[PDB]
Amino acid sequence: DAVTIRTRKVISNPLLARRQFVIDVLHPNRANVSKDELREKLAEIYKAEKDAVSVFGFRTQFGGGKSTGFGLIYQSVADAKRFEPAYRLVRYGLAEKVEKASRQQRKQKKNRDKKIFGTQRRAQKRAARRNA
Amino acid sequence: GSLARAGKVKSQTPKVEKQEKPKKPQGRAYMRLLYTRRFVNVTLTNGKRKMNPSPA
Amino acid sequence: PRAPRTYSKTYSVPKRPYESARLDAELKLAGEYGLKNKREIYRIGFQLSKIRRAARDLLTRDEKDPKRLFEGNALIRRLVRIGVLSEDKMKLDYVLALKPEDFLERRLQTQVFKLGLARSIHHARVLITQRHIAVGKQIVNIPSFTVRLDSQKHIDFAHNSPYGGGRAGRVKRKNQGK
Amino acid sequence: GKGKPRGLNSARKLRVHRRNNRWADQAYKARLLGTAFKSSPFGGSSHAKGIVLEKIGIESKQPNSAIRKCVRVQLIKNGKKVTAFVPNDGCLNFVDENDEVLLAGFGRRGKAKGDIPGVRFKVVKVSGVSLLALWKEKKEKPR
RNA sequence: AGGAUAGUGGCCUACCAUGGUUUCAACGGGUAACGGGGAAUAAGGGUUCGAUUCCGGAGAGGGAGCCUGAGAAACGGCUACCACAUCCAAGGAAGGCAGCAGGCGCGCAAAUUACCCAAUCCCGACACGGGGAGGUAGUGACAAUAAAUAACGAUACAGGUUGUAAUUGGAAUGAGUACAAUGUAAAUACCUUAACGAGGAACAAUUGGAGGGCAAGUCUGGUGCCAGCAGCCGCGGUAAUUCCAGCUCCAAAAGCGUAUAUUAAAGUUGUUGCAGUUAAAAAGCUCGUAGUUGAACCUUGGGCUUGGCUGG
């Protein structure tokens, strides 16, 4: 319902090939506007690639009806993939979440491996020799 | 001295159950109740003010 | 670790707990501004104590003292802005003459009732706390919100409030549709 | 000349004189001599847990005529044996022998209170349960 | 003079002199003593505290000695002894939570064996790896901030044009419950917000107290110097304003009481600012050293020129 966006504090940053600004969201009679929709709305206004638009840090003012955030647009989708943080790419569907076990499992692996010198194949081969 | 007479009066006191009364207003509404009562409907008997008058 | 976050107390209790002159006078003050508890009188008394204390040190300094001159107008300007200090009393001497009644005059609850938006002073708080009063385009539910002069003329109901053109409330929809 | 030196170069004499004379003040002497740390049964603390050795009722002082009901408690931290009062109506029975009781002071700063002779402590809890709640039956003793 | 050191220096050695500190407190003892920035309280002056978010020092069970390395007398490095302690096949081997979490003890006394490198930064061969450093969540009434438990009407008595005490209603909202969206490394929570969600609106506020100090009963029932209460003074010995209950009322309020220490009150530690004939306290009296304190007196007046700021 009459979702109007205002961008202030705009600074052009060719050093990273992106333009950054503070986004003021006016969404009366609305709970709040999702991050994905403002990507289509902002990209169409600036005629830029949706996948090259990053928006985050949204906090709604008291009483509702107005939101503020921070906006990012890149000169290409490739630029967005190169410099935007990995978790943001997961949020926008531009990349997949890397699969790893919990921090406990990785830490106990490294300590267990440190008790072994050389290749892991040799140590078990000697271990297989020892008990047999 | 002995320990025999411990807890005498509390033991032989007849039990009375507290009467159920509607809850008084709390906080600000109670704060209203204290203002209107001693500063709107003054109960002085020509300058005679007793806060908790016993039945007399 | 992280740097500590500064905080300070905003109220203080009197040294003498039971003084019928003070006990009734506070009720006379709290009762007709509809303040919930005596601590809000304490908060005004605490803040007024250090406003007087700040002006006292400046008044001890010489006239044309740069510290008195700089801090004198800034402190006075901050009071003239909130409407506590009259515009003609910019002398740092009427600052000491200030009374806790003036500060309680600039509260939102006080102003909402005095602007006709509420039937009584008690109706102002319940109306405020239920998210109905909006200052300008911002909804405020703090009864102790002190009012600046530039915001006095902008005190009204929220545009989305059921009392000012908003949607029908919870009780209305449950009853009007059954 | 008020008896005390007034010279501008007499700061040592003034500082020494006051320092010696503060030992006449009872509060200051107990702090620096550390009497509460050395000799007080609580060792300078506020509360103290102990073991009830028996239950004893003590005659009140004059002009009152009564029998104040206390207990004899042996302390865990320092091995001392003291007497602790039980302030309420009828919870002498709630405190038992060989029981764990938390104690406190009478508020008189190590001195005897009222008509109770030779007693400086009161029972705050027994078996981990507040005696005030037990008297009001807000809880029951764990046994 | 030499040795040793990164280098000065009794830091160590040889020879030689008898020096050095001290009533302006040396040396010795205690410290319930890491130091400071600071904290609490404070009219001012002060008093107490400072293990603890920063800086500096020390320690890694207690000593001691070293390797590597620019940098260590390092302990998440080693060696030896001592005190403990684990596996053992009895031959041996491996130990250091005052790091994060957790366990026992000691206690008056203090948190989860949770998630993560996304933020701050650090380290490396370094855009990429690692970081219980750090950050996030859990317990949290250590404290601090804001702030619900109702507001408005009519019938009707009472009352001096309106403030109420009952039975008569319609509206409002978030505590809560929740689609969803944001928030976030991923979440939770906050914030926004569809829908549900308030009459005994049981969606029920508590802690203390009612003789004085100190605010609020000479009410009712219970016992009868017993029980007990009472910080102090006292209450209780048969109509208890003071105990135990009811009723009522008072203070503060999501907080209130109790214990201990400290600060103010304390001009009861007094420099500001005490007292000393009789309430505590002028040495029996002189001498006298350090200390403290010590008569007056040395270019004043006059004359001229000019700048600035105060009210005109």
UniProtKB/Swiss-Prot annotation, chain A:
Keywords: Cytoplasm, Ribonucleoprotein, Ribosomal protein. One of its GO terms (biological process) is translation. Pfam families: Ribosomal_S24e. Residues 100-132 are annotated as: Disordered. GO terms for molecular function: structural constituent of ribosome. Disulfide bonds: none annotated. Component of the small ribosomal subunit. Mature ribosomes consist of a small (40S) and a large (60S) subunit. The 40S subunit contains about 32 different proteins and 1 molecule of RNA (18S). The 60S subunit contains 45 different proteins and 3 molecules of RNA (25S, 5.8S and 5S). Component of the ribosome, a large ribonucleoprotein complex responsible for the synthesis of proteins in the cell. The small ribosomal subunit (SSU) binds messenger RNAs (mRNAs) and translates the encoded message by selecting cognate aminoacyl-transfer RNA (tRNA) molecules. The large subunit (LSU) contains the ribosomal catalytic site termed the peptidyl transferase center (PTC), which catalyzes the formation of peptide bonds, thereby polymerizing the amino acids delivered by tRNAs into a polypeptide chain. This is Small ribosomal subunit protein eS24. The lineage of its organism: Eukaryota, Fungi, Dikarya, Ascomycota, Saccharomycotina. The gene is RPS24.
Swiss-Prot record, chain B:
Its main location: cytoplasm. GO terms for cellular component: cytosolic small ribosomal subunit. One of its GO terms (biological process) is translation. Pfam families: Ribosomal_S30. One of its GO terms (molecular function) is structural constituent of ribosome. Residues 1-28 are annotated as: Disordered. Keywords: Cytoplasm, Ribonucleoprotein, Ribosomal protein. Belongs to the eukaryotic ribosomal protein eS30 family. PANTHER family: 40S RIBOSOMAL PROTEIN S30/UBIQUITIN-LIKE PROTEIN FUBI, RIBOSOMAL PROTEIN S30, ISOFORM A. Component of the ribosome, a large ribonucleoprotein complex responsible for the synthesis of proteins in the cell. The small ribosomal subunit (SSU) binds messenger RNAs (mRNAs) and translates the encoded message by selecting cognate aminoacyl-transfer RNA (tRNA) molecules. The large subunit (LSU) contains the ribosomal catalytic site termed the peptidyl transferase center (PTC), which catalyzes the formation of peptide bonds, thereby polymerizing the amino acids delivered by tRNAs into a polypeptide chain. This is Small ribosomal subunit protein eS30. It comes from Candida albicans (strain SC5314 / ATCC MYA-2876) (Yeast). The lineage of its organism: Eukaryota, Fungi, Dikarya, Ascomycota, Saccharomycotina. The gene is RPS30.
From Swiss-Prot, chain C:
GO terms for cellular component: cytosolic small ribosomal subunit. NCBIfam families: PRK04051.1, uS4_arch. Residues 106-177 form the S4 RNA-binding domain. GO terms for molecular function: rRNA binding; structural constituent of ribosome. SMART domains: Ribosomal_S4, S4. One of its GO terms (biological process) is translation. Keywords: Cytoplasm, Ribonucleoprotein, Ribosomal protein, RNA-binding, rRNA-binding. It is found in: Cytoplasm. Pfam families: Ribosomal_S4 (PF00163), S4 (PF01479). Its main location: cytoplasm. This is Small ribosomal subunit protein uS4. Component of the ribosome, a large ribonucleoprotein complex responsible for the synthesis of proteins in the cell. The small ribosomal subunit (SSU) binds messenger RNAs (mRNAs) and translates the encoded message by selecting cognate aminoacyl-transfer RNA (tRNA) molecules. The large subunit (LSU) contains the ribosomal catalytic site termed the peptidyl transferase center (PTC), which catalyzes the formation of peptide bonds, thereby polymerizing the amino acids delivered by tRNAs into a polypeptide chain. Residues 159-178 are annotated as: Disordered. Belongs to the universal ribosomal protein uS4 family. Component of the small ribosomal subunit. Mature ribosomes consist of a small (40S) and a large (60S) subunit. The 40S subunit contains about 32 different proteins and 1 molecule of RNA (18S). The 60S subunit contains 45 different proteins and 3 molecules of RNA (25S, 5.8S and 5S). PROSITE patterns: RIBOSOMAL_S4, S4.
UniProtKB/Swiss-Prot annotation, chain D:
Its main location: cytoplasm. It is found in: Cytoplasm. One of its GO terms (biological process) is translation. The keyword Glycoprotein does not apply. It comes from the Eukaryota. One of its GO terms (molecular function) is structural constituent of ribosome. PROSITE patterns: RIBOSOMAL_S12. Signal peptide: none annotated. The keyword Amino-acid biosynthesis does not apply. Keywords: Cytoplasm, Ribonucleoprotein, Ribosomal protein. Pfam families: Ribosom_S12_S23. One of its GO terms (cellular component) is ribosome. Belongs to the universal ribosomal protein uS12 family. NCBIfam families: PRK04211.1 (NF003254), uS12_E_A (TIGR00982). Component of the small ribosomal subunit. Mature ribosomes consist of a small (40S) and a large (60S) subunit. The 40S subunit contains about 32 different proteins and 1 molecule of RNA (18S). The 60S subunit contains 45 different proteins and 3 molecules of RNA (25S, 5.8S and 5S). PANTHER family: 30S RIBOSOMAL PROTEIN S12 FAMILY MEMBER. Component of the ribosome, a large ribonucleoprotein complex responsible for the synthesis of proteins in the cell. The small ribosomal subunit (SSU) binds messenger RNAs (mRNAs) and translates the encoded message by selecting cognate aminoacyl-transfer RNA (tRNA) molecules. The large subunit (LSU) contains the ribosomal catalytic site termed the peptidyl transferase center (PTC), which catalyzes the formation of peptide bonds, thereby polymerizing the amino acids delivered by tRNAs into a polypeptide chain. This is Small ribosomal subunit protein uS12. It comes from Candida albicans (strain SC5314 / ATCC MYA-2876) (Yeast).
